[PDB]
Every structure is written in C-alpha cells, then in structure tokens.
Write a protein that binds this DNA or RNA. Sequence first.
DNA 1: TGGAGAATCCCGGTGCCGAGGCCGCTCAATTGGTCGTAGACAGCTCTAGCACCGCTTAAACGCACGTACGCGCTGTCCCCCGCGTTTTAACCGCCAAGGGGATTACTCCCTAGTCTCCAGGCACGCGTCAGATA
DNA 2: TATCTGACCGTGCCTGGAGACTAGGGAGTAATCCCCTTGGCGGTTAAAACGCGGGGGACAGCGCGTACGTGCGTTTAAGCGGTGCTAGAGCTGTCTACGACCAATTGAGCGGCCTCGGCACCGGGATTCTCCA
Lengths: 91, 90, 81, 81, 106, 108, 96, 96
Amino acid sequence: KESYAIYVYKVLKQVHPDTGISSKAMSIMNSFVNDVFERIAGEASRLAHYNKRSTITSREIQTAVRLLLPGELAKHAVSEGTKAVTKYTSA
Amino acid sequence: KESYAIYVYKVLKQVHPDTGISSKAMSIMNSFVNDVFERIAGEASRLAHYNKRSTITSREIQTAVRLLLPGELAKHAVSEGTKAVTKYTS
Amino acid sequence: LRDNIQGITKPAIRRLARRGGVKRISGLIYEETRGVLKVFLENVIRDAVTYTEHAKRKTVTAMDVVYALKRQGRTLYGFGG
Amino acid sequence: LRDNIQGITKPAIRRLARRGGVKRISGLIYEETRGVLKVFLENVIRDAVTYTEHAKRKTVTAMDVVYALKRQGRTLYGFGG
Amino acid sequence: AKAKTRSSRAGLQFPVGRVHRLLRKGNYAERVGAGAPVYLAAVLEYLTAEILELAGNAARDNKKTRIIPRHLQLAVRNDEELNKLLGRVTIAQGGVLPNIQSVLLP
Amino acid sequence: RAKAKTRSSRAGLQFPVGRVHRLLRKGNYAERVGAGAPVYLAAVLEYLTAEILELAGNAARDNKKTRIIPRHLQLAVRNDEELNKLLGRVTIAQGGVLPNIQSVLLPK
Amino acid sequence: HRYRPGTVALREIRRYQKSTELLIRKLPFQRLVREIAQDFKTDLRFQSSAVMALQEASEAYLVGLFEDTNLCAIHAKRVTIMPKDIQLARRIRGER
Amino acid sequence: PHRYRPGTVALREIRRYQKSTELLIRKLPFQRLVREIAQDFKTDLRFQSSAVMALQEASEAYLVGLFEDTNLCAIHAKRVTIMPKDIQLARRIRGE
DNA sequence: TGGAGAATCCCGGTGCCGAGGCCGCTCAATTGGTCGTAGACAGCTCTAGCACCGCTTAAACGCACGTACGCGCTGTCCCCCGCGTTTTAACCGCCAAGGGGATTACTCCCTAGTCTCCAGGCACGCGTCAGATA
DNA sequence: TATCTGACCGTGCCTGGAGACTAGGGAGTAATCCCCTTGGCGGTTAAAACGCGGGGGACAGCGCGTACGTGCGTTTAAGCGGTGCTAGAGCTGTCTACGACCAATTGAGCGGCCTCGGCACCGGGATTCTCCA
C-alpha cells in the first residue's frame, strides 16, 4: 500500500517540531491529500480537454488550483507552486 | 461542429410523427445527451479504476446506469442496453 | 431480520439532537428521524451493494461505502481513499 | 461604471418573486436580493474570467459561463453545454 | 463487402461509432470494449425517447405541434425520476411549474 | 553517471514529485503530462498539508495534547473559513462538531 | 375601481408562472455584468450569449431562492417574506 | 429532594455531547439495521466491520447536521421545541 | 443576596499500547539517449462586439390612501423534561468452523493499430407552414 | 376568423466509420491459503423503558399601528433600427523543443520488529454554579 504518511510527518516536523500525530489523523490527512489531488487533476484534465490540448502543464494545474481553492488559499498556493517551478527550472 | 440533432429528430419521428421540435429545444436535447454521456462515462471510468481494470465494457456501463439513473429508468435502460448488446452480438 | 428500526432508540436520537444543539424535542421527532435514517441508509447501502456486485464480491468493504458516499457528495475521510 | 446594482429594480425583483410564488414582499427584500445576486454573479463571473484567461482570450464566451455553472452544480442547457 | 452500420446491427438510431470515438478520445480508460458503445447508445436513445414522449404530450396538451423549451421543462419537472436525474439542471426559456401554496389563496 | 538527485530535492519540496507524476500519468487525465505540473501540484499539496497541520497543532496545543487526534483536525478545518469552504462536503471521522449553542437557547 | 389587496398579486403569480420571458431588463443586467467583471480583468469583452446565459442562470437561481423563501415565510406563520427567510434558506442550502 | 429546572440538564447535555467525539448510537442495533436494509438488495451478503463503522459515522454526521438545520428552522418560528415540520422544511430546502 | 448540593476542573499516581525510530531490501524513481509530433509563434481573414444617434413607447418612479397583516400581549392546558426504579439487552472475552478475498500461473480471446474506401452526415439553398396579432 | 414572417427537405463535398488482417497483452479460469466474518456461550452492568409530577412553552385569541398593495400621473431610458469601425477569434503553415519510451542503475520508502512515554483512567480536593429562602 502506498500512502503519503512519511511526507505528512516531514511537513509536520517542519511546521510543528514537537507535535506528534496519531494513526486516524494520518488516515484523514492521506485521504485529504488524495481528494485534493483528485480534484485538481480532474479540473486540469477538464481544462485540457476544453481547449483541445493533449497535455497537462503547470498552467493547467495553476488555473485548476485558482478555480478550486478559495481566495487567500488560491493566491498562496500559486505562490509556492510558482516558486517550486522556478527553482526546479533554474536547477 | 458535431451534434445529435438528426438522431433526436429520428427518435421524435419514431414516437411522435406529427410533432416537430424547435432549435432551442434541439440545443437543450443535445446538451442533455452530452450530460448523460459524460455522467455514465465518468462513472464507468471510476468503476474501472476502482477494480484495477484497464477496459470499459458493458458491465461498467450497466453499473453506471444502475448507479446514476433512478429505479424504473435504470431498469428500463438496462433492459434496452442488454437487448441492443445481444442483438449486436447475434 | 425484521423491525430493527426500533433499535435506534429515543435516547440515541436525543443524544444526536444534543450534539446538534437541540434543547427541547417533541415526541413525534423520533419516528421521522427513524424514517430519515432509513432513507439515507437505503440510498448509501444500495450504491455500496452495486459497487460490491460489480466487483463480484460477497462482502461489502469500507471503500464501497466511501465510494457510495462520494457518489452523492458526502465524502468521508478516515476510512481510505 | 458605478452604482449599477440599482438597475435590478424593485419591479424586477417583484416579478421574480411572483414567478417564485411570493404573494407579499417586505421593503427590505430588495437590498438583500441585490446582494445575493451580486455574490452569485461574482462567483460565476470570476470562474468564467479564469476560464477565458486560461485560453488566452479577451472575450468571455457562453461556453465559459456554461462550464463555470457546471462547476458549481448549476448546469445550464440550451447554450451548447 | 457492403458496409453495414453498427447501429443497424444493434437496432438503434443513435450512432455506435460516434459514441465509441467519444469514449476513445474522452480519456476514460486505456481500452474500450465493443459492447459499451452499443449499451450507452441504447441508454441514450431510451432517455431521449422518454423526454421526447413527455414533451410531445405536454405540447399536445397546449394544442401545439412543435416542442418548445417550456414543454421540455414541463416534461422534466412533471415526472419524478426525470426530475431526480435533472435536479441541478437549468433549462433555458423553461420557466417553472405553476404552483401556488394553499395559504396564499383566500 | 552523476549522483541521483531527487526531483523533490531540486524543487525544495518534501512531497514526492515522482509519485505525483506517476499518479498523474496512470490516472487517465491526459495523453501527455508536462514536466513542471507534478512539481506545481506537489507544492500545492504540501502547502495545503502544512496549512491544515499548523492549525491542528495549534488546536492540540490549546487542549494540552502533544499528539494530533481527529478532533484537532476537525477544529482546525471548521475554525478556518477557507478550509471550511474547501471541505464543506467532507465528514471527518471521529471528528465531532464545533461547540455552538444558539443565543435564544441560553437562559435570560 | 380598487381591488382587494392580494388578488392582483395572485393574478401576477398566475401570469408570471406560465411565461418564459426574462423578468430583468437586458441593459441593466449587461451593465452589472461588465461592472462585476471589471474587478477581475480590465478591458474585457463579452459575447451576447454569455450575458444571456448569465441572465438565465441568475433568474432561475433567484426564482428558486424565492420559492424556498416563501416556504420559510409560511413556516413562520406569515405570508410576507422578510430578509431572515432569505438568510435561513441560504444557510440551509449552505451558502452562508 | 433537589430538582433542576427544565433546560439546565439539556444545555449540560448539549455541552458534553459537543465537547465529545464518540458515537451516540449503539453498535449492534445499527449493525442489524444495516443488515436488514442490505438483505432487501442482495441476499447472503457479508459486511466488514469498517464498512459498518463508516456507515455509522456518516449517518451520525448527517443526523447531527440535519438537527442543526431543524433547530434553526424551529428558532425561525419563534420556538425552542423541534417538530417534524422543521425537519420536513429543512429537507425540502436542501432537496431531499 | 447567602447557603446546600451537585457538577466540573485540577493535580498526583499507574500502566499500557501505539507511535516513533531502526534495519534489510526491493522495486520504483532517476539518468542518459532517441525520436516523432504537439503546440508555440507569425500572419491573415473576416466575424462580431463596441460605440453612437433618434425615437417611441413600455416600463419605472413618486405619491396618496386604506386595509390586510405583523407583532406584542395574555391565558391555559398539555406535553415534555427531570428523576427514580426495574428490566433488558448491549458489551466484552473467548472459541471455532469455514466461506471467501487474495495470490499465482497460464492460455486465449478481445481489442488497439493501420490501409483503404465509400457512404452517411453537415453546410446550404429553396419552398412554405406554424404561432402570433388583429 | 384573416393574414403574416420567418423558421422551420433536396443536393453536393468530404471525412470518419466500416471491413480486414496482425500482434500482443489483459483478463478469465483453476487451484490454494491464510485472514476474518459469523455464530455461539456466559457474565455483568450500563443503558433503556416505564412511571409520575409539574412547569413552561406552544398555541389560540385579540387589539393596534404601520407598511405594503393598488392605482394614477409623469419621467426616463430600455429597445429597435441603422451606421461605422476595429479588436481579435479562428484558421493555416512551419518548425522545434519537449515529452513518451526504453535500458541500466540505485537509494527511498515500506514491511517487520522493538521499546518507552503520552495519555486514558481513578480519586481527593478546590471551584464554580444552579437553585431556593
């Protein structure tokens, strides 16, 4: 079985260094990550099919995030996403 | 641009011979056929992904029709699809 | 198995109303709440059994219930996905 | 462009309430209805603007509004959807 | 040999080939079976026939021989199952069902 | 060959770019997947995970708990407006409800 | 002469429940759409069918909301609709 | 003896059941209800324990949200007691 | 406003089980090279969206008057809450078959892929009949 | 009932569906194995059912005061028609860079194992806290 458990633990230790987490909260966070991934991937697929594109790009995921997430969350998610794409391209 | 206009008109002349259909009504019927197509195809795709299957078959479409459509509509639609599939195979 | 809707007892509906913030409950609430629960459980269980029968299984797994709940927009985190 | 919410007049809101079946209307309904319409139009128009700026267009199409309403579970027929 | 359409083999009016193409390029599965477009074409033809039946009845109730969007709206909201299938759907130029509550009437 | 550097490390992310790419290609979303799309999606997923986990840790600190239970996740989601809008149709199992008694229910 | 208060309202209810025409004037709704969309993108164009789609969706949404508002007003033993009925209906739907 | 006025124990129960997070329906009657509903769809059908727990969690969350909407409907009619017309109005506004 | 009983919070001790860390390894991610096509970019055509003017006419707006209706108040009775008591069936622990979910192997039939070709479906012009107004 | 204006079947091009063959891989079927679902038995004890008093709130009646409904005259700008113009939607062509694909390598994550501290639980005591005089 593949899960997002160790990455959620790494993000938690980055954010809260002395706060632990239980197994049920891990199952909820894994389901949250899977649900958000499915939502953004489905919206980006629908965006690619609307404009006669056979490719999902970072632009597709960006406008899917901007469609799905509310205002402050959308703006900040665009901020770290564009930062990550910029750092991936530069190195 | 493709549309289901001639097929909807054929079904209408099949069941209501002395009855035409307007252009906006035809656009609504085309949007209805597209919406039901997208619903059944998406549910069948999700069913295939849940069962670790790489094909969409008549079983997936039948289960999608059973899931989406209400009771008597689902029963009659499953009967029509099974009749068409058996007539196609025969 | 017959007449198991009486297993959802009146103090259970009282506790569920207390969690919702209901200070005072009338006596005809319980039959309506039992009917509402039966309608909801029928709607979820029918889709779960359909998902099970497509898989050619004899057991209703938790993911079938999760997919049934996601079918009518009632996503349930904590049981798999 | 300013003060354009007042173009949704009191007889227009009255006609919408008469189509909805409302027999008697308060005087404070109209401001509330204009605010609800502004919120709904802001949501749908923002989604349609995002759809028409993803395609690198400066014209909002009818299919953009159709896709935006289909996203919020308000599917609109008769416009190529 | 002579070309026979797959809709004629299945005894349908809706195109099996177009539904098969839209299933193949719609990105639903890697493979698409032979009976799935026949099944989905039959289901779509049946639902079209049901909507057009009730719309023709609503048009004949108003002494009109042409179906307008109002007749489709009356057909959808007058049948319980079709209203359940089309509950979150707005039909343009459709209007509403005529309903007045009992307390509003004198 | 050179040293095998992870795609997550060269984008500065903890979430896996490679797993996100392999779930995007096998999810039947498009015929092609771009290179920067899994990076962008992993960044968005990591941001949302950190946003929920910060408020969940704050809720666990408010209840004097070192660990995070589903109640803390429910409090974190429903006490924030944007996370409640994102997760409005989502039931958190073993999560409970917010404390809310109406003003007219309380005695005068 | 003068009718009793309520029968002209019932005649208007029966008139507007059998028609399909749009009850909001086209130009004020168009200007409201261009006023709202100015906050998202400057110098933006609209097709005519996009504005008609927005008008049809907005009219259907307001009519359904006023139906639920009327049920909320009837539930409180009233015939006059008030803003608290709109707020209650929008909360039960989940828009507030 | 000592008696509390009616309403104090109710508010105490509201506080202690909104502070808690457990399941308020007994497990075995819910399991028999689930099995007697499922036997009308397919006979000789088994159930995982996690499926019944997931059904119980979804059912409890649905009933608690419905009772919140029912309570706000009852407050809208200048009442404290909830009645079946409140549940019917809430389900009609949601669309059930 | 003072006081008795009840509930609620706080702090100290116990122990237990699940969370956090470590280890071998295996398989999925990474690196290097190739190749074909998706889309980026430039260019042009022609649709159609924007701005403006006149007018005439339906719709909106302001104001007067009156009545239906919202709302506050009062009374009463009935229905539900609080609490004590009895019963009952839920909850936990512990076995025990045994049906069914999961895994592996194999072998075969179904479906993608491609060449060809031709006929069904789409755009368009011509004929004309259905709701609408008077 | 009389009349009207557009909004509704035949013809030509063309492109995508059909027929046919080949390859290959997904899936169906047989065997098997270990988890886990179901059923049963017994104690126990917690919770549900039942009964009863009483109080407070739901509901009906009633008066009043005001705020919408209806109607009528005046204003005003929506709507239709027409003209003009230019942004830009949409199609076509070329090419190039970027993603699919494949083979070899390798280290990151996953299953298993182990251990200890975070927290549920129990109880004495302070601290509200509700209700009655």
